[PDB]
Design an enzyme around this catalytic site. Structure first.
Site, PDB file in Angstrom:
ATOM      1  N   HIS A   1      38.674  25.656  47.780  1.00  0.00           N
ATOM      2  CA  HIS A   1      39.212  24.275  47.468  1.00  0.00           C
ATOM      3  C   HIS A   1      38.706  23.321  48.603  1.00  0.00           C
ATOM      4  O   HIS A   1      38.592  22.130  48.336  1.00  0.00           O
ATOM      5  CB  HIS A   1      40.722  24.291  47.365  1.00  0.00           C
ATOM      6  CG  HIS A   1      41.200  24.954  46.088  1.00  0.00           C
ATOM      7  ND1 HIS A   1      42.032  24.321  45.166  1.00  0.00           N
ATOM      8  CD2 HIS A   1      40.829  26.129  45.516  1.00  0.00           C
ATOM      9  CE1 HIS A   1      42.168  25.093  44.096  1.00  0.00           C
ATOM     10  NE2 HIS A   1      41.427  26.173  44.255  1.00  0.00           N
TER      11      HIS A   1
ATOM     12  N   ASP B   1      34.375  21.357  55.272  1.00  0.00           N
ATOM     13  CA  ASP B   1      34.497  20.464  56.430  1.00  0.00           C
ATOM     14  C   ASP B   1      35.902  20.314  56.897  1.00  0.00           C
ATOM     15  O   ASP B   1      36.179  19.503  57.796  1.00  0.00           O
ATOM     16  CB  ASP B   1      33.932  19.057  55.995  1.00  0.00           C
ATOM     17  CG  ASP B   1      34.705  18.428  54.846  1.00  0.00           C
ATOM     18  OD1 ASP B   1      35.567  19.071  54.183  1.00  0.00           O
ATOM     19  OD2 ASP B   1      34.462  17.217  54.574  1.00  0.00           O
TER      20      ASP B   1
ATOM     21  N   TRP C   1      29.528  36.070  40.976  1.00  0.00           N
ATOM     22  CA  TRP C   1      29.677  36.814  42.228  1.00  0.00           C
ATOM     23  C   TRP C   1      30.838  36.244  43.054  1.00  0.00           C
ATOM     24  O   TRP C   1      31.593  37.028  43.695  1.00  0.00           O
ATOM     25  CB  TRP C   1      28.386  36.642  43.093  1.00  0.00           C
ATOM     26  CG  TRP C   1      27.202  37.210  42.377  1.00  0.00           C
ATOM     27  CD1 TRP C   1      27.193  38.121  41.306  1.00  0.00           C
ATOM     28  CD2 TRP C   1      25.856  36.898  42.637  1.00  0.00           C
ATOM     29  NE1 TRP C   1      25.859  38.373  40.902  1.00  0.00           N
ATOM     30  CE2 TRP C   1      25.046  37.624  41.695  1.00  0.00           C
ATOM     31  CE3 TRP C   1      25.231  36.015  43.566  1.00  0.00           C
ATOM     32  CZ2 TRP C   1      23.629  37.531  41.688  1.00  0.00           C
ATOM     33  CZ3 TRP C   1      23.837  35.881  43.528  1.00  0.00           C
ATOM     34  CH2 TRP C   1      23.068  36.614  42.583  1.00  0.00           C
TER      35      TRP C   1
ATOM     36  N   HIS D   1      38.815  37.024  42.703  1.00  0.00           N
ATOM     37  CA  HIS D   1      39.982  37.196  41.848  1.00  0.00           C
ATOM     38  C   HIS D   1      40.364  38.719  41.763  1.00  0.00           C
ATOM     39  O   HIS D   1      41.429  39.035  41.222  1.00  0.00           O
ATOM     40  CB  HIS D   1      39.652  36.643  40.440  1.00  0.00           C
ATOM     41  CG  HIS D   1      39.829  35.150  40.395  1.00  0.00           C
ATOM     42  ND1 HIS D   1      39.832  34.442  39.202  1.00  0.00           N
ATOM     43  CD2 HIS D   1      39.968  34.237  41.383  1.00  0.00           C
ATOM     44  CE1 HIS D   1      39.983  33.146  39.472  1.00  0.00           C
ATOM     45  NE2 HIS D   1      40.051  33.013  40.776  1.00  0.00           N
TER      46      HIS D   1
ATOM     47  N   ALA E   1      46.475  36.297  42.945  1.00  0.00           N
ATOM     48  CA  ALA E   1      47.567  36.201  41.941  1.00  0.00           C
ATOM     49  C   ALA E   1      47.815  34.727  41.671  1.00  0.00           C
ATOM     50  O   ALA E   1      47.263  33.864  42.335  1.00  0.00           O
ATOM     51  CB  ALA E   1      48.859  36.801  42.569  1.00  0.00           C
ATOM     52  N   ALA E   2      48.618  34.456  40.631  1.00  0.00           N
ATOM     53  CA  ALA E   2      48.945  33.066  40.270  1.00  0.00           C
ATOM     54  C   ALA E   2      50.393  32.799  40.430  1.00  0.00           C
ATOM     55  O   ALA E   2      51.240  33.612  39.981  1.00  0.00           O
ATOM     56  CB  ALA E   2      48.539  32.813  38.812  1.00  0.00           C
ATOM     57  N   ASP E   3      50.692  31.580  40.944  1.00  0.00           N
ATOM     58  CA  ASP E   3      52.131  31.137  41.038  1.00  0.00           C
ATOM     59  C   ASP E   3      52.378  29.955  40.116  1.00  0.00           C
ATOM     60  O   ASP E   3      53.566  29.782  39.688  1.00  0.00           O
ATOM     61  CB  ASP E   3      52.403  30.633  42.448  1.00  0.00           C
ATOM     62  CG  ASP E   3      52.544  31.743  43.405  1.00  0.00           C
ATOM     63  OD1 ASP E   3      52.553  32.979  43.060  1.00  0.00           O
ATOM     64  OD2 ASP E   3      52.604  31.427  44.619  1.00  0.00           O
TER      65      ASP E   3
ATOM     66  N   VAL F   1      50.299  28.992  37.176  1.00  0.00           N
ATOM     67  CA  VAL F   1      49.809  29.084  35.817  1.00  0.00           C
ATOM     68  C   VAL F   1      51.023  29.334  34.910  1.00  0.00           C
ATOM     69  O   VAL F   1      51.208  28.603  33.922  1.00  0.00           O
ATOM     70  CB  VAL F   1      48.729  30.200  35.680  1.00  0.00           C
ATOM     71  CG1 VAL F   1      48.379  30.315  34.194  1.00  0.00           C
ATOM     72  CG2 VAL F   1      47.424  29.720  36.447  1.00  0.00           C
TER      73      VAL F   1
ATOM     74  N   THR G   1      44.894  45.737  41.171  1.00  0.00           N
ATOM     75  CA  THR G   1      44.817  46.089  42.588  1.00  0.00           C
ATOM     76  C   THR G   1      44.634  44.834  43.505  1.00  0.00           C
ATOM     77  O   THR G   1      43.601  44.652  44.066  1.00  0.00           O
ATOM     78  CB  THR G   1      43.702  47.080  42.855  1.00  0.00           C
ATOM     79  OG1 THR G   1      42.446  46.511  42.378  1.00  0.00           O
ATOM     80  CG2 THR G   1      43.961  48.432  42.077  1.00  0.00           C
TER      81      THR G   1
END
Ligand code: HEM
Ligand SMILES: [Ca+2]
Ligand SMILES: [Ca+2]
EC number: 1.11.1.16
Length: 319
Positions: A47, A62, A164, A169, A173-175, A177, A189
Site C-alpha cells: 500500500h 517512500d 509472483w 496471500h 487474512a482479511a478483517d 472483506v 497455512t
C-alpha cells in the site's frame, strides 16, 4: 564491517539497522513471530509502494502512507491500514531511519520469521516522502483482472509479476472483506509461506465462511478460509492462470520470484545505485518441512483446471 556489538554486515552504514531489527522483532512482531503484525507489515509495503503512477505522481516506496497518513488512510482501499501505520509510526520517530526504509525493512524482517520465507533484498537510504500518493492507485478485490493488470502494469509489473507478488496471500487474512469473521485466512497455512494459496484458490468454491453478500468476496472452498473475487478470477483468467498454476508445488520458484519482485516493488520511486545494500541484515528464515497437498478429502475433481497447456499437478490429499 563489525558493528559495535560484534554482529557483522558487508557495508558499515548498515550497522544502524541492528538495534532497529531487535526492537521490531521484540516490540512489533511480538518476539519474531509470523503472525498478524508481520502480515500487516507486508500488506503495508504494497500500500506504500503502489502509490506510484507515471502520469499522476506519488513517490512509490517512500513512506508516504505514514508521513501523509491523514490523507492516504482516507482512501477506501486503505481501510484497516491505519492500525499498522499507528503501530509503526513510533519506531520511525525513535530510530534514525526514514519511514520509507522502515516500512520495507519491517516487511523484509517480518517475512523472514515465516517458514518457507525468503530474505527480500533490502537497501538503506530512501529520503523522506515529499508528496502524498494520488488517490485510486491501490487495486481492490472487486476489480476486474484487466483493471488490476492495467494498474500493476502502469506501476511497472507484468502479469506474471502480479502472480509472483500474490504469494504474499499465502501469509494473509482479511478483517474488512467480511467484518463478521475477521482474521479468516486466504489459505490454510497463514503462518507458512508456501504454495497452499495457489492450490486452494484453484478449488471450486463451495460456501461463504461468514455472510453471503460481501463486495469483492467469492465463495471459498473451505469453512475456515475466505476467497477474494480478485484471487478467484486471476487463478482462472487466461492472462494469468498458467502462471498461477505453475506456482503450485513449486516452492523454489515462489521463493526466487517473490524475493526478486518484492525487491523491485520496494524500490519503486527509488534508485538502487543511490542507496546502500543491507540485505545481509535480514534474518535467515526457517525452511518448510511438510509437502504441498490438496486439503484432505479433496481430489483433482474438485480443482477447476484453467491452464490449457499443462494439467494441474496430481498432488496427494487425504491420507
Ligand atoms: C494485486 C491485487 C491485490 C488485491 C486486490 C489485494 C487485496 C487484498 C485484500 C482485499 C486484503 C484483505 C484486507 C482486509 O479486509 O483486512 C488483502 C490482505 C493482504 N494483502 Fe493483498 N491484494 C493485492 C496484492 C497484494 C500484494 C502485491 C501484496 C504484497 C505485499 C499483498 C499483501 C497482503 C497481505 C500480506 C495481506 C494480509 C494482511 C493481514 O493479514 O493483516 N497484497 N489483500
Ligand atoms: Ca508511498
Ligand atoms: Ca500459506
Amino acid at each position: 564491517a563489525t558493528c559495535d556489538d560484534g554482529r557483522t554486515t558487508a557495508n558499515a552504514a548498515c550497522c544502524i539497522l541492528f538495534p532497529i531489527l531487535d526492537d521490531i522483532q521484540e516490540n512489533l512482531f511480538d518476539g519474531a513471530q509470523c503472525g498478524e503484525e508481520v502480515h500487516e507489515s507486508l500488506r503495508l509495503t504494497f500500500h506504500d509502494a503502489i502509490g506510484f503512477s507515471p502520469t499522476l505522481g506519488g513517490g512509490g516506496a517512500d513512506g508516504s502512507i505514514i508521513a501523509f497518513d491523514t490523507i492516504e488512510t482516507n482512501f477506501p482501499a486503505n481501510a484497516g491500514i491505519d492500525e499498522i501505520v499507528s503501530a509503526q509510526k513510533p519506531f520511525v520517530a525513535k530510530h534514525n531511519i526514514s519511514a520509507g526504509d522502515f516500512i520495507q525493512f519491517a516487511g523484509a524482517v517480518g517475512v523472514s520469521n515465516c517458514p518457507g520465507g525468503v530474505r527480500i533484498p533490502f537497501f538503506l537510504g530512501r529520503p523522506d516522502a515529499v508528496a502524498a500518493s494520488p488517490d485510486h492507485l491501490v487495486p481492490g478485490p472487486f476489480d476486474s483482472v484487466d483493471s488490476i493488470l492495467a494498474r500493476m502494469g502502469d506501476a511497472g509489473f507484468s502479469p506474471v509479476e502480479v502472480v509472483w507478488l500474490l504469494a504474499s496471500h499465502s501469509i494473509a487474512a482479511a478483517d474488512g472483506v467480511d467484518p463478521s469473521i475477521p482474521g479468516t485466512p486466504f489459505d490454510s497455512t497463514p503462518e507458512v509461506f508456501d504454495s497452499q494459496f495457489f492450490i486452494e484458490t484453484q478449488l471450486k468454491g463451495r460456501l461463504f465462511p461468514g455472510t453471503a453478500d460481501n463486495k469483492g468476496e467469492a465463495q471459498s472452498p473451505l469453512q475456515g478460509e475466505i476467497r477474494l473475487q480478485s484471487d478467484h478470477l486471476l487463478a482462472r483468467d487466461p492472462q494469468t492462470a498458467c502462471e498461477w498454476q505453475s506456482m503450485v508445488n513449486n516452492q523454489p520458484k515462489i521463493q526466487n520470484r517473490f524475493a526478486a519482485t518484492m525487491s523491485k516493488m520496494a524500490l519503486l520511486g527509488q534508485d538502487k545505485t543511490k542507496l546502500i545494500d543491507c540485505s545481509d541484515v535480514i534474518p535467515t528464515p526457517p525452511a518448510l518441512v511438510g509437502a504441498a497437498h490438496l486439503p484432505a478429502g479433496f481430489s483433482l475433481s474438485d480443482v477447476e483446471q484453467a491452464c490449457a497447456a499443462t494439467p494441474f499437478p496430481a498432488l496427494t490429499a487425504d491420507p
